[PDB]
Structures are given as C-alpha cells and as structure tokens.
RNA sequence: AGCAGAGUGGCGCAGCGGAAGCGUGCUGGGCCCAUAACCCAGAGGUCGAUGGAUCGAAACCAUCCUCUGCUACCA
C-alpha cells in the first residue's frame, strides 16, 4: 500500500521542483 | 481481443485525458465535445494493446523512447526499452466509469461488468475524500477487488498535503479491501511512473477467471449506431450493442436478444414484455475483426437491432443474453438488503452528509442497480430485511450477484447501502 | 458527420440580366445670437471565394470560405 507510495515518492518528488 | 476490464475511476478535479491516454493511448469520447469541464462524467470506452520490451512499461508503437506530451515545462523522458518488433503480451480493455457525485448510478452500472479498477485520487480536495469512500466500498460489493490506488493530481500538491489524503481515505475504507491496493503517486503533469503503473495493471490485474464455455452474457452499457445521419437506402445495417461480456464467449452471427427488453402493447398491469432478438453482424477487437467475443472485455457487438434502438444510448444496463436466454425478466422484485450506517458518496470537511439515514418508507422510489442494470422503482412493502419493490420497466437480473440501493436524499439518489436478489 | 439559414457600404441590409440598394453612424455648410429640432452637401461597396454559362452577374448558377444549427455522437 504505502511502500508503493514511499518508493515512488523519492522517484517522483526528486523530479518535481 | 480483450481479456481484462480496468476501471479508470476517480473523483473531481484530477484530469482524465492525460492519465487514460498514458495507460491506453485511445481517448474516451462522446457528444458535448465541447469535451468536459473537470473530469469525464460519461461512461466511456477505452481499448489498447499493452505490451512490454522485457521492460514493464507500456511503450508507444514507436517503442524506442517514451517522450510524452503531458507538459511542456519538463520533458518527460522514460525509457520503455528500444525497437525490435515488440512481443504482444495481452490485450487490455478499459471501462471509464463516471467520477462525479451526481453520476454515482451510471458508475455502478459500468463497473458491474468490469474486472478491475483504478482509484484516481486528486490531491486538491479534502483529505477525508468522499468518493474514495464511495467507489471502493462499491467495488467491494460488485465481487471485485482488483484496485490500484492511483493518486493522480499531486503535481502542485506538495508531498505533505499528498501525505495526509491517502492515509485518511484508507482510514475510512478500513472495512473495504483497499489495503491490497497499492497507492501509487504519479504525475498528471510529468506523465510520470507510467512505466511503473502499467507494470501494476499487468501485475495487480491479471486475466480474471472468466467463463469462456458458458452462455454469452453480454450486458450492454453503451449503444452505438452505424446507421448515422447521412446514410442511404442500400446501406442498410443493424445497431451496434457494445458492452462488456461477463460470461460466455460470443460469436458472430449469433441471434442475441435484449432479455429485459421492452413493454409490450396494451399492458394494463405490469407483466408482459418481449426481448428484441437480433443476429450479431460483427465483433470488434480494439482495431481488428474477429469471429469470437472472448468475455471479460469491452467488446463491440454489432447486432441486427434497428437504427432507432441505437440512435441514443438506450441500452444502458440491459442483459443481452443469447436467443432463449435463461435469466428471468422482473418488473416486481423481492430484494434482501442491508443499509450502510454512513450515507456513502457524500462527505465534506465538516463530514456532511454521511450521517445515519432514516429507514425506507413504502411507496417511495429507490434506484436499484440489479446486476448491471439502471432502473428505478417504488417499494410496495418495506421491512428490515424484506423489500418488495415494483419496477417501471421489466428488468433482467443476469445473476443474483448484487444490487445497489440509493435513496433520494438530495438532487440525485445517494447510496444508503446495497443488497442481493432473493 | 448528414442537415437548415445568411454572407452586401462601418452597420442595418435592398435586390434579381439591360441595377451595388436604402436605414443608421459618419464630415462640412445651411438655419439661428446659438443650441435643440432640421435641410443641403461629404464619406461608407471584395453582393464570402471562384468565376463561368453570358450581350454584361451581385443576381443566374454551382463550388468552397465564414456565421447560424442538427441526429445529439454515429465501435
């Protein structure tokens, strides 16, 4: 549930300003 | 052709065009084009050929890179692989369910024939979001759990405001299967993680156990007319009855009826109706001809019904079983039901109006979503667990899977619970 | 998409082969000491395009362009 959040957190939010 | 049906289901102000084309590439379109104000309110179709390059992305038919067009601010560059005549894994089909609070009922009809769902969450509105409470518990009753929580609009929404919402929507669907649903933060602006999401719509969503050898149970939710204005005399055709088949493979040339059908002439009571029998002209596979309609997919079933029977979307929620179909045609209906203690489908930051609803009173109209059908009827004798409703139209239960009961507490009927057919 | 209407002076908008029309705006004079009210005079023409059948179309005649609308969506 949230492991797919926090992995894709650092993948998306490192590409977001 | 198609083996699965994934619902692209999501609440207001998250965008539908940039996310459905990211996973499919075929746009969901109907009239008023003049397209849509916020998010798609129609029950649209989407069909695609998902594949892989030994790489879990869904690449474009130019499969060297995946440079999307969801924004011009940053160039979205994912690597789906390279060229080399890709291997076709499967054929994916989508059922674009409506995601506004006003169109909850047609959402329940199109989702009752699908096999899978996506939960398209906006980070914009309130963190105890009502439709995430609405849709998922509705998915729980329609024998589906194939859910991918897809938090869609977090591009301007910061990582701490996005943090609060998926926690708090999961806190209220704690009595619903959404904990096996991964919560995927993506970009509706950078088209991001679609190489990870289209993995999950293969991973979390495989081919369901689908009855191939059974009788064809097409349930049309969308009507299509190939006898368009501008036709001629010697261009005589039928009407396309395009819905998802949940049971039984269907063939071209099959005499198919619409089993709930039409009221016959001079019905002084309620009990007389005839199904409209029709030979199937063609079967559609995403761009391609076939003679088979392998179920579990949104299949264009072109039938020999008349141009007026498809000039509008008049077959929303109709059991189109074959000629001599078994399931009965009910116009008065004995329902067993349970009433949910939260008025589901409406909840604001002040938690309105999800309080406990007054019980059903007799001679009051209530929307019943029987099988996948869209009909309204008044209850004749209402008990705690014994509802006797009479319908204005003779409707067919495809099977006694579920019903969704709603009570007119506002401008639209609002979900007070569910039930089953006795 | 098939469908119904118009295109014309800045606008309103006349018009059908022996015709680019008035109504308004528009400028100067007249009138008065002047205004108002008003008169005279000035200015405003791809008759959408294409043009042809033609003695000469704006018309006739078509086509496409624009606007107006439709089964309301047509796998």
Dig out the tokens for B392 from the structure. Answer: 């204005």
Q: Are B239 and B303 in contact (CB under 8 A)?
A: yes
Question: Residue length, chain A?
Answer: 17
Query: What DSSP designation does A14 have?
Result: T
- Contacts for B361-365 with beta carbons within 8 Å, 24 or more apart? B364/B407, B365/B408
Q: Would the CA dihedral through B379, B381, B383, B386 be positive or negative?
A: negative
For B3, half-sphere exposure in the C-beta direction (CA atoms, 13 angstrom radius) is 12
CA B230 to chain centre: 31
In this complex, the answer to whether residue B314 has its CB under 7 A from any atom of chain C, a nucleic strand, is: no
Residue the block writes with tokens 């989407």: B46
In this complex, the answer to whether residue B316 has its CB under 7 A from any atom of chain C, a nucleic strand, is: no
Chain A hits for B196, CB-CB cut-off 8 Å, are: 8, 11
Method by which this entry was solved: cryo-EM
Identical fold for domains B5-204 and B217-321, yes or no, is no
- Kindly report the bases of strand C lying within 7 A of a protein C-beta atom: 1-3, 70-75
| Chain A (1-17) residues lying within 8 Å, Cβ to Cβ, of chain B | 1-2, 4-5, 8-9, 11-13, 15-16
Phi, psi of B420 (to 5 degrees): -145, 160
A3-12 vs B194-203: helix crossing angle, rounded to 10: 160
Cα separation, B400 vs B422, whole angstroms: 7
Q: Are B227 and B239 in contact (CB under 8 A)?
A: yes
Classify burial at A12, counting beta carbons within 10 Å of its beta carbon; exposed 0-12, middle 13-18, buried 19 or more.
Answer: buried
Measured CB to CB, residues of chain B less than 8 Å from chain A are: 74, 149, 151, 154-155, 159, 166-167, 170, 178-187, 190, 192-193, 196, 200
Q: Are B110 and B41 in contact (CB under 8 A)?
A: no
Asked whether the bond before B158 is cis by omega within 30 degrees of 0, the reply is: no
Q: Are B94 and B20 in contact (CB under 8 A)?
A: yes
Tell me the sheet residues that pair with B389: B333, B379
In this complex, the answer to whether residue B302 has its CB under 7 A from any atom of chain C, a nucleic strand, is: yes
In the A/B pair of chains, how many CB contacts fall below 8 A? 45
- Residue B349 CB contacts under 8 Å (≥ 6 apart), including other chains: B126, B128
For B286, half-sphere exposure in the C-beta direction (CA atoms, 13 angstrom radius) is 20
Report CA(B313)–C1'(C7) in Å, whole number: 38
d(CA A3, nearest CA chain B) in Å: 8
Q: How close are the terminal C-alpha atoms of chain B, in Å? A: 35
Dig out the tokens for B398 from the structure. Answer: 């495809």
Reference B97, options B55, B59, B131; nearest CA is: B131
Domain assignments of chain B as residue spans, ordered by start: 5-204, 217-321, 328-421
In this complex, the answer to whether residue B252 has its CB under 7 A from any atom of chain C, a nucleic strand, is: no
Contact A1 B186 (CB under 8 A): no
For B369, half-sphere exposure in the C-beta direction (CA atoms, 13 angstrom radius) is 27
Cα separation, B181 vs B272, whole angstroms: 45
Q: Which fold has domain B5-204?
A: Rossmann fold (3.40.50)
Q: Which CATH number fits domain B217-321: 2.40.110.10, 2.40.30.10, 3.10.20.30, 3.40.605.10?
A: 2.40.30.10
Cα separation, B419 vs B368, whole angstroms: 9
- Residue B324 CB contacts under 8 Å (≥ 6 apart), including other chains: none
Classify burial at B388, counting beta carbons within 10 Å of its beta carbon; exposed 0-12, middle 13-18, buried 19 or more.
Answer: middle
Task: Provide the pairing of β-strand B92-96 with B6-10.
Answer: parallel
Classify burial at B398, counting beta carbons within 10 Å of its beta carbon; exposed 0-12, middle 13-18, buried 19 or more.
Answer: buried
Cα separation, B282 vs B78, whole angstroms: 38
Report CA(B32)–C1'(C8) in Å, whole number: 35
User: Which of the residues B132, B155, B192, B201 would you substitute to probe the A interface, choosing the one with the greatest number of A C-beta atoms within 10 Å?
Assistant: B192
In this complex, the answer to whether residue B61 has its CB under 7 A from any atom of chain C, a nucleic strand, is: no
Which chain A residue lies closest to B196 (C-alpha atoms)?
Answer: A8
Classify burial at B309, counting beta carbons within 10 Å of its beta carbon; exposed 0-12, middle 13-18, buried 19 or more.
Answer: buried
Chain A hits for B200, CB-CB cut-off 8 Å, are: 4
Reference B130, options B12, B7, B6; nearest CA is: B12
- Residue B52 CB contacts under 8 Å (≥ 6 apart), including other chains: B58, B59, B81, B86, B87, B89, B202
Report CA(B231)–C1'(C17) in Å, whole number: 40
Dig out the tokens for B190 from the structure. Answer: 């950078």
| C-alpha separations of B218 from B222, B282, B367 in Å | 11, 14, 22
Chain A hits for B184, CB-CB cut-off 8 Å, are: 4-5, 8
Report CA(B273)–C1'(C27) in Å, whole number: 80
Dig out the tokens for B124 from the structure. Answer: 């914009």
B336: number of Cβ within 10 Å: 14
Which helix (DSSP H) or strand (DSSP E) does residue A6 occupy? Answer: helix A3-12
Cα separation, B123 vs B23, whole angstroms: 20
Per-residue burial over B89-107, b if 16 or more Cβ lie within 10 Å, else e, is ebbbbbbbbbbbbebbbbb
Cα separation, B187 vs B194, whole angstroms: 9
Cα separation, B49 vs B47, whole angstroms: 7
Tell the CATH superfamily of the B328-421 domain: Translation factors (2.40.30.10)
Task: Provide the pairing of β-strand B387-396 with B329-344.
Answer: antiparallel
Which chain B residue lies closest to A2 (C-alpha atoms)?
Answer: B183
Phi, psi of B132 (to 5 degrees): -65, -30
**CA Rg value for chain A:** 8
Phi, psi of B28 (to 5 degrees): -85, 120
Angle at B51 between CA B139 and CA B189, to 5 degrees: 65
In this complex, the answer to whether residue B330 has its CB under 7 A from any atom of chain C, a nucleic strand, is: no
Cα separation, B180 vs B167, whole angstroms: 14
| C-alpha separations of B272 from B29, B261, B265, B369 in Å | 37, 10, 8, 21
Q: Are B136 and B119 in contact (CB under 8 A)?
A: yes
Cα separation, B12 vs B103, whole angstroms: 11
Q: Would the CA dihedral through B309, B310, B314, B315 be positive or negative?
A: positive
Chain A hits for B187, CB-CB cut-off 8 Å, are: 12, 16
Report CA(B33)–C1'(C49) in Å, whole number: 30
What's chain B look like in SS3?
Answer: CCCCCEEEEECCCCCCHHHHHHHCCCCCCCCCCCCCCCCCCCCEEEEECCCECCCCCCCCCCCCCEECCCCCCCCCEECCCCCCCCECCCCEEEEECCCCCCCHHHHHHHHCCCCEEEEEEECCCCCCCHHHHHHHHHHHHCCCCCEEEEEEECCCCCCCHHHHHHHHHHCCCCCCCCCCCCEEECCCCCCCCHHHHHHHHHHCCCCCCCCCCCCCEEEEEEEECCCCCCCCCCCCCCEEEEEEEEECCEECCCEECCCCCEECCCCCCCCCEECCCEEEEEEEECCEEECEECCCEEECEEEEECHHHCCCCCCCCEEEEECCCCCCEEEEEEEEEEEEEEEECCCCCCCCCCCCCCCCCCCCEEEECCCCCCEEEEEEEECCCCEEEEEEEEEECCCCCCEEEEECCCCCCEEEEEEEEC
């Amino acid at each position: 549930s949230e492991k797919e959040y926090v992995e894709m957190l650092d993948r998306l939010y490192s590409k977001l300003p | 052709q198609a083996t699965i049906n994934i619902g692209t289901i999501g609440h207001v102000a998250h965008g539908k065009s940039t996310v459905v084309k990211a996973i499919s590439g075929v746009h969901t379109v109907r009239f008023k084009n003049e397209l849509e104000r916020n998010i798609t309110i129609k029950l649209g179709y989407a069909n695609a050929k998902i594949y892989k390059l030994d790489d879990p992305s869904c690449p474009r038919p130019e499969c060297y890179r995946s440079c999307g067009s969801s924004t011009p601010d940053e160039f979205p560059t994912d690597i789906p692989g390279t060229k080399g005549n890709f291997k076709l894994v499967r054929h994916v089909s989508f059922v674009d369910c409506p995601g506004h609070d006003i169109l909850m009922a047609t959402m329940l009809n199109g989702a009752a024939v699908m096999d899978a769902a996506l939960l398209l969450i906006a980070g914009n509105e309130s963190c105890p979001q009502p439709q995430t409470s609405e849709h998922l518990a509705a998915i729980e009753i329609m024998k589906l759990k194939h859910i991918l929580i897809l938090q869609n609009k977090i591009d301007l929404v910061k990582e701490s405001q996005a943090k609060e919402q998926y926690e708090q929507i999961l806190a209220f669907v704690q009595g619903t299967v959404a904990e096996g649903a991964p919560i995927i933060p993506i970009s509706a602006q950078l088209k991001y993680n679609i190489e990870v999401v289209c993995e999950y719509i293969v991973k979390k969503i495989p081919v369901p156990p689908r009855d191939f050898t059974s009788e064809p149970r097409l349930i049309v939710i969308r009507s299509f007319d190939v006898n368009k204005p501008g036709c001629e005399v010697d261009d005589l055709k039928g009407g396309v009855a395009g819905g998802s088949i949940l049971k039984g493979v269907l063939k071209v040339g099959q005499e198919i009826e619409v089993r709930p059908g039409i009221v016959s002439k001079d019905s002084e009571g309620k009990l007389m109706c005839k199904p409209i029998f029709s030979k199937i002209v063609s079967l559609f596979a995403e761009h391609n001809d076939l003679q088979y309609a392998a179920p579990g997919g949104l299949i264009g079933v072109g039938t020999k019904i008349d141009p007026t029977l498809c000039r509008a979307d008049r077959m929303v929620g109709q059991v189109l079983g074959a000629v001599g179909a078994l399931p009965e045609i009910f116009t008065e209906l004995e329902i067993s039901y349970f009433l949910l203690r939260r008025l589901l489908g409406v909840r604001t930051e002040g938690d309105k109006k999800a309080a406990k609803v007054q019980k059903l009173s007799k001679n009051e109209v209530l929307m019943v979503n029987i099988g996948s059908l869209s009909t309204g009827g008044r209850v004749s004798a209402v008990k705690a667990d014994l509802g006797k409703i009479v319908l204005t139209n003779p409707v067919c239960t495809e099977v006694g899977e579920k019903i969704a009961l709603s009570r007119r507490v506002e401008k639209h009927w609002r979900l007070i619970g569910w039930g089953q057919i006795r």
